[PDB]
């Protein structure tokens, strides 16, 4: 009778407030991965540069002191 | 030989839905969304493993190649 039917009604607004839940989670998540994902780029840049003028310098200094 | 008898007509309650068919809807929309989200969120994961991956090696050459050239110096120095 009326036990079943509170049941029904009760048993749906539920899993709406935990899919708002997630969607939430989920949408922070992107935005965050964004933000990582710039930070990485950046950060392999400057690695990139860094080992390029480690090179560049060993290699000169190595020259210089053979030469003397 | 006021004796009556009687027969019985049956009838249905309503199946368990009419509840099932507004909230069902929205829930199924953000189920697609939250799937759509998550899809996305895998390709750019994969990708900046990748790029970690790549950082790695030019990491391990630098080391390499300041360890040596500190050792190099340090052996014609003396």
């Given at each position: 009778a009326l036990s079943e039917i509170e049941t029904r009604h009760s048993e749906i607004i539920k899993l709406e407030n935990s899919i708002r839940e997630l969607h939430d989670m989920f949408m922070d998540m992107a935005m965050l991965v964004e933000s990582q994902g710039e930070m990485i780029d950046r950060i392999e840049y400057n690695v990139e540069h860094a080992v390029d003028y480690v090179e560049r310098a060993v290699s000169d200094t190595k020259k210089a002191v053979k030469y003397q | 030989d006021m004796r009556n008898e009687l027969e019985e007509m049956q009838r249905r309650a309503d199946?368990?839905?009419?509840?099932?068919?507004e909230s069902t809807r929205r829930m199924l929309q953000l189920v697609e969304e939250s799937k759509d989200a998550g899809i996305r969120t895998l390709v750019m994961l994969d990708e900046q493993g990748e790029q970690l991956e790549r950082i790695e090696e030019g990491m391990d050459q630098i080391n390499k190649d300041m360890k040596e050239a500190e050792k190099n110096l340090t052996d014609l120095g003396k």
């Open positions: - | 199946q368990l839905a009419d509840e099932s068919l």
